[PDB]
Amino acid sequence: DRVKKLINSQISLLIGKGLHEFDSLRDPEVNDFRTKMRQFCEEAAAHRQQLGWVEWLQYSFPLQLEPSARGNRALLVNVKFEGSEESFTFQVSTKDMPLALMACALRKKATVFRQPLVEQPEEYALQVNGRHEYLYGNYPLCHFQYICSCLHSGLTPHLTMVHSSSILAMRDEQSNPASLWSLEQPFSIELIEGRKVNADERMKLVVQAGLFHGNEMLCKTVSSSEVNVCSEPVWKQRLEFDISVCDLPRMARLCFALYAVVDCPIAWANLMLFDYKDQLKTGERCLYMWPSVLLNPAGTVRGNPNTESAAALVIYLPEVAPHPVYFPALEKILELGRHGERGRITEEEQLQLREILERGELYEHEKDLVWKMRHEVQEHFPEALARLLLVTKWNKHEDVAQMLYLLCSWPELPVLSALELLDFSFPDCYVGSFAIKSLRKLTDDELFQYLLQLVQVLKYESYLDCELTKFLLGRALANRKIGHFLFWHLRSEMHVPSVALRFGLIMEAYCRGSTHHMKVLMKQGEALSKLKALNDFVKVSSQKTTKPQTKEMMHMCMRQETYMEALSHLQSPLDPSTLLEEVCVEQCTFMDSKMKPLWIMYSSEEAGSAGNVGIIFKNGDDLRQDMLTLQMIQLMDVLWKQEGLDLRMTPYGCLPTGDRTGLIEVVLHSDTIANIQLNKSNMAATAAFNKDALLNWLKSKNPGEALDRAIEEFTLSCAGYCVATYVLGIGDRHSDNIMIRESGQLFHIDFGHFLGNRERVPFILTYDFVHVIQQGKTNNSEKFERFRGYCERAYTILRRHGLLFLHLFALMRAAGLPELSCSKDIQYLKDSLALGKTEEEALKHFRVKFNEALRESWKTKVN
Ligand SMILES: COc1ncc(-c2cc3c(c(OCCN4CCC(C(C)(C)O)CC4)c2)COC3)cc1NS(C)(=O)=O
């Protein structure tokens, strides 16, 4: 009653779209999606509320383990018990498990409190002080990201013993409240008229129409007659296609482009020929067209919601039968596909097939041999499914039936293979369903790693209710960190009309599954709303007065009760494990670039030093490409660490949250190379030669024996970023967008341009950095060549995972980023990783690029 109405208003506010707008569409596909997904998500919520206390820790605080640990040394730890000011500091080993640490804390408590405690270490979990992060399970302490981080920074781990009854209290508080194949005639449509068309009156209007199965044409395109430009053009003509109705695949899309000719593009529109209930569409359709920025098959199959201004195309789908017609059921397809001749070939033809399947464009005879030998592909080359799918004639229903017969007994494939199958190049729904089935084995860590790409794939989906949406919702409702990022990736695109409906519906369903998480996300949205209002003030004030004046006025605005309340006590959108407790107004400011990004600092007495965290709020720029670049850098770091190579990278958080809005994580104790190289007087870093500035700064932050470790951190991170920027073609690199941590770690910021966007970005070696690597010496081949060895090792590891980067970037094409919109952009990655070459050929090639970059660096060393 009253609670259902309040929850509806809270979802509406959170997702940025009134739920009443869904009802107003009177769309059965929307209605069925809402009902089915609410039931699915409420079932997941019921399962969650009865989880055991350890399972509930797995849901809410999923373990953050080191990449080498997934699937010796002395350490001091500080441990306290919940709600007690008193703590215990003790020595443990990096190889010890949390249970031994907890048993030690319990024996310590029993001696102090003078009682032989009933509590066993099995009744507890260790919280990282003031963070939503826990250590539990049968893992050595150094396997935990928190401990491994402390061990490298030299800091003492601070942990809280939390009893099972306290974890159960958290679970309880967080509860939700109480026949086609007989139709041989050619497919045809009637193009009736156009409405609200805007073009040059001197020209003529033409409608180009094509039938597609993904990117592939099902037959040649057909064009209407040229008619004179006017607001309401009238064609009333039949467009006939070179394909029988019986041969239309299930996922066939009819694509239109309206243009003006003397070519002047105007608009485009697509639609699925079968509806969500597998019925062949008949009757009139008014297609509200999307403005053209000619045929766009990857474009959405839903009409433009701006019906007041959009050009409209009115078409007629003829009634092909006196009764409704549905795509044949799976049982009928398999029955037809069951029949076929097994391929019989010579020992040479078997060697010919093995060659092409293990090799990826083919010639016609190569395609025919693959299709002929399809049974052998299934039985002995199952990972070559994608090749067989690409040779299948999707315009012949018998060939499709034969392919589906094999797909239905195809063995599950590795994750890497399934990622390729999510591409728009594989539009069939059974293929889509097969790909998801092979992705069910993704660990939560892998899923989190590829979540951004899986969300982009939703933009290629033809219908609202789909296996990918159910999969993501199911995984999000079983892991709070996944749920957090799924919400933000969808929410940050609500201002995009082509996805607002789909994304709004998914976010509503998720909210049905966790009323409590909806409220936690609302608190984050309230802080972002205040940051946007504050940033607008800063933008205006910065153009009228001095920075100390704008900063004092920013502080006065933040000190208002409504701002102090909204900006405090939230989970960070960048990392829900990070708690943003007390906003430190005195330390807040803004940066001097065009959009005046805000620099917001927080503190938390419960987290101690670890509670000192910062966020950058930036409004005016699209942060999606920065996020993708940083996530690709983070992936390189994981892949290197899995081979035991830690290049001390800094993949700081970057999250779009709204229209040209997002957050960026602050890396404290860091400064830009430009600021350090200003070589200011009366500073500990001041130098005789500007080349000494960076090394002098590192020496001032790392006195005595600590200097050596800082130079090594610099060398390792420099190698990681040299390789990362070269592979990704990160350009426009200068002293203002390269930073250094006091630890010595170098890192890059502000990823404006990548994939050479178009010019081939060469490998870069900067003399100032070569100088630090060489410990300030002019000649130090021992250190310089160790650094070259790190670059080579890093590069060879990435090449081995070359296909993973290609498959992920291929899926990213769905995002519509201007620097990742075609094959040329992905060709850049193929060249940088030299994937066509042997490891020896690619290493020789990299060596030539590294040596070319050294000679270029030496043009500075000569000076
Ligand atoms: C996508 O856009 C960006 N991407 C990343 C960053 C970024 C990230 C990080 C850091 C940064 O520091 C910039 C140095 N410095 C910090 C302190 C500032 C003081 C408090 C004194 O005003 C003075 C500037 C900057 C540090 O940790 C991580 C900034 C931008 N946007 S921009 C270029 O318009 O600023």
Side-chain angles (χ1 to χ4, degrees), residues 824-854:
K824 286 169 183 171
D825 299 320
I826 269 139
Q827 188 55 58
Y828 197 97
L829 248 190
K830 298 181 182 186
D831 292 350
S832 77
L833 288 174
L835 289 167
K837 298 181 189 287
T838 68
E839 191 184 300
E840 294 185 346
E841 280 175 356
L843 199 43
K844 181 195 172 185
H845 179 253
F846 179 84
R847 277 165 187 168
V848 172
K849 297 283 154 202
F850 183 104
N851 282 342
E852 270 173 20
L854 178 56

PDB file of all heavy atoms in Angstrom, residues 824-854:
ATOM      1  N   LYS A 824      39.521  -0.119 -38.407  1.00  0.00           N
ATOM      2  CA  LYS A 824      40.818   0.566 -38.374  1.00  0.00           C
ATOM      3  C   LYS A 824      41.292   0.798 -36.928  1.00  0.00           C
ATOM      4  O   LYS A 824      42.484   0.658 -36.640  1.00  0.00           O
ATOM      5  CB  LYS A 824      40.747   1.900 -39.134  1.00  0.00           C
ATOM      6  CG  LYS A 824      40.706   1.720 -40.649  1.00  0.00           C
ATOM      7  CD  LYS A 824      40.378   3.011 -41.381  1.00  0.00           C
ATOM      8  CE  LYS A 824      40.280   2.784 -42.869  1.00  0.00           C
ATOM      9  NZ  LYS A 824      39.758   3.980 -43.580  1.00  0.00           N
ATOM     10  N   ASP A 825      40.350   1.141 -36.020  1.00  0.00           N
ATOM     11  CA  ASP A 825      40.635   1.361 -34.602  1.00  0.00           C
ATOM     12  C   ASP A 825      41.132   0.064 -33.952  1.00  0.00           C
ATOM     13  O   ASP A 825      42.136   0.095 -33.253  1.00  0.00           O
ATOM     14  CB  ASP A 825      39.406   1.955 -33.881  1.00  0.00           C
ATOM     15  CG  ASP A 825      38.967   3.305 -34.429  1.00  0.00           C
ATOM     16  OD1 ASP A 825      39.847   4.132 -34.750  1.00  0.00           O
ATOM     17  OD2 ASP A 825      37.743   3.546 -34.507  1.00  0.00           O
ATOM     18  N   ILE A 826      40.487  -1.077 -34.250  1.00  0.00           N
ATOM     19  CA  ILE A 826      40.879  -2.395 -33.746  1.00  0.00           C
ATOM     20  C   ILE A 826      42.160  -2.912 -34.461  1.00  0.00           C
ATOM     21  O   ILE A 826      42.929  -3.668 -33.860  1.00  0.00           O
ATOM     22  CB  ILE A 826      39.663  -3.372 -33.788  1.00  0.00           C
ATOM     23  CG1 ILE A 826      38.913  -3.310 -32.437  1.00  0.00           C
ATOM     24  CG2 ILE A 826      40.038  -4.832 -34.140  1.00  0.00           C
ATOM     25  CD1 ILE A 826      37.470  -3.332 -32.539  1.00  0.00           C
ATOM     26  N   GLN A 827      42.403  -2.467 -35.719  1.00  0.00           N
ATOM     27  CA  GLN A 827      43.607  -2.823 -36.488  1.00  0.00           C
ATOM     28  C   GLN A 827      44.833  -2.254 -35.763  1.00  0.00           C
ATOM     29  O   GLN A 827      45.892  -2.875 -35.759  1.00  0.00           O
ATOM     30  CB  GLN A 827      43.527  -2.270 -37.933  1.00  0.00           C
ATOM     31  CG  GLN A 827      44.646  -2.760 -38.887  1.00  0.00           C
ATOM     32  CD  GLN A 827      44.738  -4.263 -38.963  1.00  0.00           C
ATOM     33  OE1 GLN A 827      43.776  -4.953 -39.314  1.00  0.00           O
ATOM     34  NE2 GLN A 827      45.886  -4.808 -38.586  1.00  0.00           N
ATOM     35  N   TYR A 828      44.661  -1.094 -35.119  1.00  0.00           N
ATOM     36  CA  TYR A 828      45.695  -0.445 -34.327  1.00  0.00           C
ATOM     37  C   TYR A 828      46.241  -1.398 -33.231  1.00  0.00           C
ATOM     38  O   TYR A 828      47.454  -1.513 -33.059  1.00  0.00           O
ATOM     39  CB  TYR A 828      45.161   0.839 -33.689  1.00  0.00           C
ATOM     40  CG  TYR A 828      46.305   1.693 -33.224  1.00  0.00           C
ATOM     41  CD1 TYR A 828      46.779   2.734 -34.010  1.00  0.00           C
ATOM     42  CD2 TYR A 828      47.010   1.375 -32.065  1.00  0.00           C
ATOM     43  CE1 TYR A 828      47.898   3.465 -33.637  1.00  0.00           C
ATOM     44  CE2 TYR A 828      48.164   2.061 -31.716  1.00  0.00           C
ATOM     45  CZ  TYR A 828      48.578   3.129 -32.485  1.00  0.00           C
ATOM     46  OH  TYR A 828      49.668   3.855 -32.132  1.00  0.00           O
ATOM     47  N   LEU A 829      45.339  -2.075 -32.511  1.00  0.00           N
ATOM     48  CA  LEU A 829      45.681  -3.054 -31.472  1.00  0.00           C
ATOM     49  C   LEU A 829      46.325  -4.288 -32.066  1.00  0.00           C
ATOM     50  O   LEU A 829      47.253  -4.855 -31.472  1.00  0.00           O
ATOM     51  CB  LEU A 829      44.411  -3.479 -30.750  1.00  0.00           C
ATOM     52  CG  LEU A 829      44.219  -3.067 -29.310  1.00  0.00           C
ATOM     53  CD1 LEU A 829      43.036  -3.786 -28.767  1.00  0.00           C
ATOM     54  CD2 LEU A 829      45.453  -3.391 -28.431  1.00  0.00           C
ATOM     55  N   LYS A 830      45.840  -4.724 -33.245  1.00  0.00           N
ATOM     56  CA  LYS A 830      46.430  -5.886 -33.930  1.00  0.00           C
ATOM     57  C   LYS A 830      47.883  -5.609 -34.298  1.00  0.00           C
ATOM     58  O   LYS A 830      48.720  -6.501 -34.151  1.00  0.00           O
ATOM     59  CB  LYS A 830      45.638  -6.282 -35.187  1.00  0.00           C
ATOM     60  CG  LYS A 830      44.202  -6.715 -34.921  1.00  0.00           C
ATOM     61  CD  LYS A 830      43.495  -7.122 -36.209  1.00  0.00           C
ATOM     62  CE  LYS A 830      42.058  -7.510 -35.969  1.00  0.00           C
ATOM     63  NZ  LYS A 830      41.418  -8.049 -37.199  1.00  0.00           N
ATOM     64  N   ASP A 831      48.192  -4.364 -34.728  1.00  0.00           N
ATOM     65  CA  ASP A 831      49.554  -3.956 -35.118  1.00  0.00           C
ATOM     66  C   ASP A 831      50.433  -3.761 -33.904  1.00  0.00           C
ATOM     67  O   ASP A 831      51.537  -4.269 -33.894  1.00  0.00           O
ATOM     68  CB  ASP A 831      49.515  -2.642 -35.912  1.00  0.00           C
ATOM     69  CG  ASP A 831      48.864  -2.772 -37.265  1.00  0.00           C
ATOM     70  OD1 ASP A 831      48.607  -3.921 -37.694  1.00  0.00           O
ATOM     71  OD2 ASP A 831      48.576  -1.735 -37.875  1.00  0.00           O
ATOM     72  N   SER A 832      49.944  -3.021 -32.871  1.00  0.00           N
ATOM     73  CA  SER A 832      50.708  -2.775 -31.646  1.00  0.00           C
ATOM     74  C   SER A 832      51.091  -4.092 -30.958  1.00  0.00           C
ATOM     75  O   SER A 832      52.205  -4.208 -30.471  1.00  0.00           O
ATOM     76  CB  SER A 832      49.945  -1.842 -30.703  1.00  0.00           C
ATOM     77  OG  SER A 832      48.911  -2.546 -30.037  1.00  0.00           O
ATOM     78  N   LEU A 833      50.196  -5.091 -30.960  1.00  0.00           N
ATOM     79  CA  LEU A 833      50.488  -6.397 -30.381  1.00  0.00           C
ATOM     80  C   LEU A 833      51.118  -7.373 -31.402  1.00  0.00           C
ATOM     81  O   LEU A 833      51.447  -8.499 -31.026  1.00  0.00           O
ATOM     82  CB  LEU A 833      49.252  -7.008 -29.694  1.00  0.00           C
ATOM     83  CG  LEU A 833      48.809  -6.336 -28.351  1.00  0.00           C
ATOM     84  CD1 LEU A 833      47.525  -6.932 -27.859  1.00  0.00           C
ATOM     85  CD2 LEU A 833      49.876  -6.478 -27.259  1.00  0.00           C
ATOM     86  N   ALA A 834      51.315  -6.929 -32.677  1.00  0.00           N
ATOM     87  CA  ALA A 834      51.922  -7.717 -33.773  1.00  0.00           C
ATOM     88  C   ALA A 834      51.438  -9.180 -33.745  1.00  0.00           C
ATOM     89  O   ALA A 834      52.237 -10.127 -33.733  1.00  0.00           O
ATOM     90  CB  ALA A 834      53.444  -7.646 -33.677  1.00  0.00           C
ATOM     91  N   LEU A 835      50.107  -9.346 -33.704  1.00  0.00           N
ATOM     92  CA  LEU A 835      49.457 -10.645 -33.524  1.00  0.00           C
ATOM     93  C   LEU A 835      49.566 -11.615 -34.706  1.00  0.00           C
ATOM     94  O   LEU A 835      49.428 -12.826 -34.502  1.00  0.00           O
ATOM     95  CB  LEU A 835      47.998 -10.450 -33.105  1.00  0.00           C
ATOM     96  CG  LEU A 835      47.829  -9.911 -31.670  1.00  0.00           C
ATOM     97  CD1 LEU A 835      46.414  -9.446 -31.418  1.00  0.00           C
ATOM     98  CD2 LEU A 835      48.293 -10.927 -30.617  1.00  0.00           C
ATOM     99  N   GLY A 836      49.858 -11.106 -35.901  1.00  0.00           N
ATOM    100  CA  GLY A 836      50.042 -11.970 -37.068  1.00  0.00           C
ATOM    101  C   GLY A 836      51.380 -12.689 -37.082  1.00  0.00           C
ATOM    102  O   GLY A 836      51.545 -13.681 -37.796  1.00  0.00           O
ATOM    103  N   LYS A 837      52.341 -12.193 -36.276  1.00  0.00           N
ATOM    104  CA  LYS A 837      53.722 -12.663 -36.162  1.00  0.00           C
ATOM    105  C   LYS A 837      53.954 -13.757 -35.123  1.00  0.00           C
ATOM    106  O   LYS A 837      53.143 -13.968 -34.221  1.00  0.00           O
ATOM    107  CB  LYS A 837      54.646 -11.476 -35.817  1.00  0.00           C
ATOM    108  CG  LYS A 837      54.691 -10.364 -36.854  1.00  0.00           C
ATOM    109  CD  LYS A 837      55.647  -9.253 -36.427  1.00  0.00           C
ATOM    110  CE  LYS A 837      55.561  -8.026 -37.305  1.00  0.00           C
ATOM    111  NZ  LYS A 837      56.171  -8.249 -38.644  1.00  0.00           N
ATOM    112  N   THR A 838      55.118 -14.424 -35.230  1.00  0.00           N
ATOM    113  CA  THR A 838      55.579 -15.403 -34.250  1.00  0.00           C
ATOM    114  C   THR A 838      56.098 -14.564 -33.054  1.00  0.00           C
ATOM    115  O   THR A 838      56.333 -13.362 -33.223  1.00  0.00           O
ATOM    116  CB  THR A 838      56.703 -16.266 -34.847  1.00  0.00           C
ATOM    117  OG1 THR A 838      57.871 -15.462 -35.048  1.00  0.00           O
ATOM    118  CG2 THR A 838      56.294 -16.962 -36.155  1.00  0.00           C
ATOM    119  N   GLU A 839      56.292 -15.176 -31.869  1.00  0.00           N
ATOM    120  CA  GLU A 839      56.805 -14.437 -30.708  1.00  0.00           C
ATOM    121  C   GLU A 839      58.200 -13.831 -31.005  1.00  0.00           C
ATOM    122  O   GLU A 839      58.482 -12.711 -30.583  1.00  0.00           O
ATOM    123  CB  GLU A 839      56.840 -15.314 -29.441  1.00  0.00           C
ATOM    124  CG  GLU A 839      57.103 -14.500 -28.177  1.00  0.00           C
ATOM    125  CD  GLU A 839      57.255 -15.270 -26.879  1.00  0.00           C
ATOM    126  OE1 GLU A 839      56.300 -15.983 -26.494  1.00  0.00           O
ATOM    127  OE2 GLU A 839      58.305 -15.110 -26.217  1.00  0.00           O
ATOM    128  N   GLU A 840      59.038 -14.556 -31.766  1.00  0.00           N
ATOM    129  CA  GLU A 840      60.375 -14.100 -32.134  1.00  0.00           C
ATOM    130  C   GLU A 840      60.306 -12.909 -33.087  1.00  0.00           C
ATOM    131  O   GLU A 840      61.084 -11.963 -32.925  1.00  0.00           O
ATOM    132  CB  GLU A 840      61.207 -15.248 -32.746  1.00  0.00           C
ATOM    133  CG  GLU A 840      61.519 -16.355 -31.753  1.00  0.00           C
ATOM    134  CD  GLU A 840      62.441 -17.473 -32.213  1.00  0.00           C
ATOM    135  OE1 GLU A 840      62.697 -17.594 -33.434  1.00  0.00           O
ATOM    136  OE2 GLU A 840      62.900 -18.244 -31.338  1.00  0.00           O
ATOM    137  N   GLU A 841      59.386 -12.957 -34.082  1.00  0.00           N
ATOM    138  CA  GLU A 841      59.211 -11.873 -35.056  1.00  0.00           C
ATOM    139  C   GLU A 841      58.684 -10.612 -34.361  1.00  0.00           C
ATOM    140  O   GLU A 841      59.201  -9.528 -34.609  1.00  0.00           O
ATOM    141  CB  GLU A 841      58.291 -12.289 -36.218  1.00  0.00           C
ATOM    142  CG  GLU A 841      58.974 -13.133 -37.286  1.00  0.00           C
ATOM    143  CD  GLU A 841      58.095 -13.679 -38.401  1.00  0.00           C
ATOM    144  OE1 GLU A 841      56.857 -13.488 -38.353  1.00  0.00           O
ATOM    145  OE2 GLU A 841      58.651 -14.328 -39.318  1.00  0.00           O
ATOM    146  N   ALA A 842      57.693 -10.767 -33.461  1.00  0.00           N
ATOM    147  CA  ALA A 842      57.102  -9.652 -32.707  1.00  0.00           C
ATOM    148  C   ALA A 842      58.096  -9.019 -31.739  1.00  0.00           C
ATOM    149  O   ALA A 842      58.097  -7.796 -31.588  1.00  0.00           O
ATOM    150  CB  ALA A 842      55.881 -10.125 -31.955  1.00  0.00           C
ATOM    151  N   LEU A 843      58.947  -9.843 -31.091  1.00  0.00           N
ATOM    152  CA  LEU A 843      59.956  -9.331 -30.162  1.00  0.00           C
ATOM    153  C   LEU A 843      61.053  -8.559 -30.917  1.00  0.00           C
ATOM    154  O   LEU A 843      61.471  -7.487 -30.466  1.00  0.00           O
ATOM    155  CB  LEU A 843      60.511 -10.457 -29.275  1.00  0.00           C
ATOM    156  CG  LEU A 843      61.235 -10.082 -27.976  1.00  0.00           C
ATOM    157  CD1 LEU A 843      60.523  -8.963 -27.200  1.00  0.00           C
ATOM    158  CD2 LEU A 843      61.395 -11.305 -27.093  1.00  0.00           C
ATOM    159  N   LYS A 844      61.438  -9.057 -32.111  1.00  0.00           N
ATOM    160  CA  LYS A 844      62.389  -8.387 -32.989  1.00  0.00           C
ATOM    161  C   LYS A 844      61.784  -7.039 -33.394  1.00  0.00           C
ATOM    162  O   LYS A 844      62.477  -6.021 -33.340  1.00  0.00           O
ATOM    163  CB  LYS A 844      62.671  -9.250 -34.241  1.00  0.00           C
ATOM    164  CG  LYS A 844      63.674  -8.639 -35.218  1.00  0.00           C
ATOM    165  CD  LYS A 844      63.631  -9.327 -36.585  1.00  0.00           C
ATOM    166  CE  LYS A 844      64.486  -8.606 -37.602  1.00  0.00           C
ATOM    167  NZ  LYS A 844      64.360  -9.202 -38.959  1.00  0.00           N
ATOM    168  N   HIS A 845      60.488  -7.039 -33.768  1.00  0.00           N
ATOM    169  CA  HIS A 845      59.774  -5.836 -34.177  1.00  0.00           C
ATOM    170  C   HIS A 845      59.703  -4.815 -33.037  1.00  0.00           C
ATOM    171  O   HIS A 845      59.983  -3.634 -33.271  1.00  0.00           O
ATOM    172  CB  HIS A 845      58.378  -6.187 -34.715  1.00  0.00           C
ATOM    173  CG  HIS A 845      57.572  -4.999 -35.135  1.00  0.00           C
ATOM    174  ND1 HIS A 845      56.505  -4.551 -34.377  1.00  0.00           N
ATOM    175  CD2 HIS A 845      57.708  -4.197 -36.221  1.00  0.00           C
ATOM    176  CE1 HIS A 845      56.028  -3.492 -35.016  1.00  0.00           C
ATOM    177  NE2 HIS A 845      56.716  -3.245 -36.134  1.00  0.00           N
ATOM    178  N   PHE A 846      59.387  -5.278 -31.801  1.00  0.00           N
ATOM    179  CA  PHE A 846      59.300  -4.420 -30.609  1.00  0.00           C
ATOM    180  C   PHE A 846      60.668  -3.824 -30.314  1.00  0.00           C
ATOM    181  O   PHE A 846      60.751  -2.640 -29.980  1.00  0.00           O
ATOM    182  CB  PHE A 846      58.794  -5.211 -29.387  1.00  0.00           C
ATOM    183  CG  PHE A 846      58.695  -4.413 -28.098  1.00  0.00           C
ATOM    184  CD1 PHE A 846      57.573  -3.636 -27.825  1.00  0.00           C
ATOM    185  CD2 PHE A 846      59.718  -4.453 -27.153  1.00  0.00           C
ATOM    186  CE1 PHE A 846      57.490  -2.890 -26.641  1.00  0.00           C
ATOM    187  CE2 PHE A 846      59.623  -3.725 -25.960  1.00  0.00           C
ATOM    188  CZ  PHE A 846      58.507  -2.955 -25.709  1.00  0.00           C
ATOM    189  N   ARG A 847      61.743  -4.648 -30.439  1.00  0.00           N
ATOM    190  CA  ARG A 847      63.125  -4.213 -30.226  1.00  0.00           C
ATOM    191  C   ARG A 847      63.512  -3.073 -31.165  1.00  0.00           C
ATOM    192  O   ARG A 847      64.172  -2.131 -30.722  1.00  0.00           O
ATOM    193  CB  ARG A 847      64.106  -5.384 -30.319  1.00  0.00           C
ATOM    194  CG  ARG A 847      64.182  -6.147 -29.011  1.00  0.00           C
ATOM    195  CD  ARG A 847      64.845  -7.494 -29.148  1.00  0.00           C
ATOM    196  NE  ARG A 847      64.719  -8.231 -27.894  1.00  0.00           N
ATOM    197  CZ  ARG A 847      64.989  -9.519 -27.743  1.00  0.00           C
ATOM    198  NH1 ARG A 847      65.403 -10.245 -28.774  1.00  0.00           N
ATOM    199  NH2 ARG A 847      64.851 -10.096 -26.558  1.00  0.00           N
ATOM    200  N   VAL A 848      63.044  -3.122 -32.435  1.00  0.00           N
ATOM    201  CA  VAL A 848      63.303  -2.066 -33.432  1.00  0.00           C
ATOM    202  C   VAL A 848      62.584  -0.777 -32.988  1.00  0.00           C
ATOM    203  O   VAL A 848      63.187   0.294 -33.034  1.00  0.00           O
ATOM    204  CB  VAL A 848      62.959  -2.487 -34.897  1.00  0.00           C
ATOM    205  CG1 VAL A 848      63.053  -1.311 -35.868  1.00  0.00           C
ATOM    206  CG2 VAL A 848      63.856  -3.625 -35.367  1.00  0.00           C
ATOM    207  N   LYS A 849      61.331  -0.899 -32.498  1.00  0.00           N
ATOM    208  CA  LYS A 849      60.529   0.231 -32.005  1.00  0.00           C
ATOM    209  C   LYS A 849      61.109   0.825 -30.721  1.00  0.00           C
ATOM    210  O   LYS A 849      61.044   2.046 -30.540  1.00  0.00           O
ATOM    211  CB  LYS A 849      59.045  -0.163 -31.794  1.00  0.00           C
ATOM    212  CG  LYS A 849      58.289  -0.577 -33.065  1.00  0.00           C
ATOM    213  CD  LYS A 849      57.877   0.617 -33.930  1.00  0.00           C
ATOM    214  CE  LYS A 849      57.739   0.233 -35.383  1.00  0.00           C
ATOM    215  NZ  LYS A 849      57.867   1.413 -36.279  1.00  0.00           N
ATOM    216  N   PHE A 850      61.657  -0.035 -29.825  1.00  0.00           N
ATOM    217  CA  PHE A 850      62.268   0.390 -28.558  1.00  0.00           C
ATOM    218  C   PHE A 850      63.594   1.108 -28.862  1.00  0.00           C
ATOM    219  O   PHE A 850      63.881   2.130 -28.251  1.00  0.00           O
ATOM    220  CB  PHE A 850      62.481  -0.817 -27.602  1.00  0.00           C
ATOM    221  CG  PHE A 850      63.035  -0.473 -26.237  1.00  0.00           C
ATOM    222  CD1 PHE A 850      62.212  -0.460 -25.117  1.00  0.00           C
ATOM    223  CD2 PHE A 850      64.386  -0.186 -26.066  1.00  0.00           C
ATOM    224  CE1 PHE A 850      62.727  -0.149 -23.853  1.00  0.00           C
ATOM    225  CE2 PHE A 850      64.896   0.151 -24.812  1.00  0.00           C
ATOM    226  CZ  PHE A 850      64.067   0.168 -23.711  1.00  0.00           C
ATOM    227  N   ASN A 851      64.394   0.567 -29.793  1.00  0.00           N
ATOM    228  CA  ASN A 851      65.662   1.160 -30.222  1.00  0.00           C
ATOM    229  C   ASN A 851      65.444   2.475 -30.974  1.00  0.00           C
ATOM    230  O   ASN A 851      66.227   3.407 -30.785  1.00  0.00           O
ATOM    231  CB  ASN A 851      66.501   0.169 -31.032  1.00  0.00           C
ATOM    232  CG  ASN A 851      67.208  -0.863 -30.190  1.00  0.00           C
ATOM    233  OD1 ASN A 851      67.375  -0.716 -28.968  1.00  0.00           O
ATOM    234  ND2 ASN A 851      67.667  -1.926 -30.832  1.00  0.00           N
ATOM    235  N   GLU A 852      64.350   2.571 -31.774  1.00  0.00           N
ATOM    236  CA  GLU A 852      63.967   3.796 -32.498  1.00  0.00           C
ATOM    237  C   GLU A 852      63.610   4.882 -31.482  1.00  0.00           C
ATOM    238  O   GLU A 852      63.975   6.043 -31.654  1.00  0.00           O
ATOM    239  CB  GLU A 852      62.766   3.538 -33.426  1.00  0.00           C
ATOM    240  CG  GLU A 852      63.169   3.097 -34.825  1.00  0.00           C
ATOM    241  CD  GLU A 852      62.051   2.672 -35.761  1.00  0.00           C
ATOM    242  OE1 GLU A 852      60.879   3.038 -35.515  1.00  0.00           O
ATOM    243  OE2 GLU A 852      62.357   1.985 -36.763  1.00  0.00           O
ATOM    244  N   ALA A 853      62.933   4.484 -30.402  1.00  0.00           N
ATOM    245  CA  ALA A 853      62.531   5.374 -29.306  1.00  0.00           C
ATOM    246  C   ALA A 853      63.742   5.793 -28.455  1.00  0.00           C
ATOM    247  O   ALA A 853      63.744   6.898 -27.934  1.00  0.00           O
ATOM    248  CB  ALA A 853      61.501   4.685 -28.437  1.00  0.00           C
ATOM    249  N   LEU A 854      64.777   4.924 -28.331  1.00  0.00           N
ATOM    250  CA  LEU A 854      65.981   5.242 -27.554  1.00  0.00           C
ATOM    251  C   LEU A 854      66.817   6.306 -28.297  1.00  0.00           C
ATOM    252  O   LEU A 854      67.268   7.272 -27.673  1.00  0.00           O
ATOM    253  CB  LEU A 854      66.811   3.969 -27.271  1.00  0.00           C
ATOM    254  CG  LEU A 854      68.146   4.118 -26.515  1.00  0.00           C
ATOM    255  CD1 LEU A 854      67.971   4.814 -25.151  1.00  0.00           C
ATOM    256  CD2 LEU A 854      68.834   2.769 -26.358  1.00  0.00           C
TER     257      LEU A 854
END
